[PDB]
Amino acid sequence: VTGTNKVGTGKGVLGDTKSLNTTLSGSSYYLQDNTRGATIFTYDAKNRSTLPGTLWADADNVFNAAYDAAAVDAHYYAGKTYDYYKATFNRNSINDAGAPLKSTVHYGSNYNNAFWNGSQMVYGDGDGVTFTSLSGGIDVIGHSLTHAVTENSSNLIYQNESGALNEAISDIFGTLVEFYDNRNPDWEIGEDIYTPGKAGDALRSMSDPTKYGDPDHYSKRYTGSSDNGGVHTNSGIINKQAYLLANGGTHYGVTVTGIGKDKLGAIYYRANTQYFTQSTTFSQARAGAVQAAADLYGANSAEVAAVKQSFSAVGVN
Template structure:
């Protein structure tokens, strides 16, 4: 019998007890193998690489049969379907594969961040499982079916705590709406409310709060607005062409209607009220460098994702991309607030106007892509992967070097940058897992520890020898394909560095074959940065 994932947790769960008969079997039978890797925290599978024959099953029938086969490993009693909800099925035409995303459920309530992905090859057989599953969720008071605390009281608790953090918030960009989840934090599982607090004043913030639905205690909180920056001609004096809209014989606006649902650029004229006023001009020759860059680079980032990865805007369905420039005064930041891009003008010393860097614009818009796909939670290792994905695709869109933000950061210091994927240590970030930051600052080192995965991506693309491991480079194009495929199909909200390695290997296998040079290089790249 497997051990409970947390000492003292009850092993009983209130579920139906219908027996099941597996309709299909793993090709390697039921014995444990190296192809089934278990979570150290929960002792449940976080990766299954054993091939699983469909035996005439497809769609949901195949998925349920597959999960039933590993039911004992997941420590599930009763009906497997009570523990998972199928969120989406995506077909990849390039690889002729199917990818399923599931959500762990407990008594009909989603378990926050605990998602799983299951992958099916062109022959209809399951090739792999990635994700995290919390077993044996107890039925004690924390896990009661009904919350003692109302949504209104939970929100009041979060707002009171937020006021201590940033001061009084009078207006929210998105109306706060508490949502009920099972929330697992530091070895405890709670019935909780998740609340997003999205605001601009007194300082921009996008805080996530988790409030105990029985006691009202704040279980966890973190701010999802990061601190990287932007691009433009603008800003650096280069001229660029971009789409606008003619409103009348003497009026043009920064609205592009040729891409998805559109790309629009606004200005707050140094206020903090979003989205501001749509940029306009009388002769269609634009002299506002920050606006020019924000608009043109948003178009360029859209084109990259559409032309390279077949993705229509950040949500995959053509969502409008809205940018606002001249936010506040001397504001040294740019951020994605969950619905749009926002750029400060910088103070001229730390930053130039932040929309002036293509890699920064692409970095921030990639946060939106990540939010709509893997949903990597912005804390600890998953948060570092979130940042790293934005750095990787910022570098891919910019495509001139492996630095981040060098065009707008510290203009008085030639060659300076925010981060380097080639050499993270040049800016104080680790380039090996053994050097990772383990403290609590910066949401658990989301910017710092991004250097580990950044270095792996650089080695994969360019090759090199690192910590005695030689990696054969496969080029930017194949590297980008692997990371995009991993991000959109394999990674889940709580993916850690080990899951990133497996996701990259599986993505390379899908795209190039199990015995390909690309797969070998992925393995070597993660060996080189100490991620197993």
């Protein structure tokens, strides 16, 4: 759509007020953001298994209706994920070429899943029990757009260790985006959307992978065909490593001194864009991460030391 930029207001999935960038055309306001280097579109699938759906249109530029919630967050958070990458690494969208960011909410009926399908974000509204509208989780969104980022960079195959690393990178950056927007920061994934009723729980833990039965050390890795080689469980290994590198701690004898989340992002972004390949394994991931930290902070630095410590702590060498 083509019109005038406007700033509307709405309430997200969690009932919080957010400022939205909309476009005014005719007597309607559309969920179209024209304020950033990449246009952000948000569609409505009207609870049908169709894509992308109709571009969200509103009459008064006030999205406070319950049906709006999913759209509000999807539109807002997508822009925030864009802000993080642009502000921090000066990356212009997923393909570093201004590719538009489209999102479709209200997909399917009680669909408990949200994902980047290769060209856009697709969100379900959950079944109310195990999930609420999945767009209410900034870490989940950062995770998914990062997948696009990886597709346009290292292109890690979603299989075995390459896949587990692919997932880890997404978790690391999803959390980093959560911190960027100060959206009640933590190292747990999907806490804001998982089980609307039960509080305190999450999809998985970066601080303590074993809290949900995930490997926090290479020795305890899943060695089977299921889940594309345990992609979603073995990611706990790298996630723990990432956590240790950022915050520091003692794990399996090894005592790591945290170098901060900012340096963490710098190291992984560089490693993923200038070193990691499609079949990168964990040990190779260690190699690339160390080299990246070497470039950014000097071969004989405290950072490079901490990188090595983190991997040794989780059993990768």
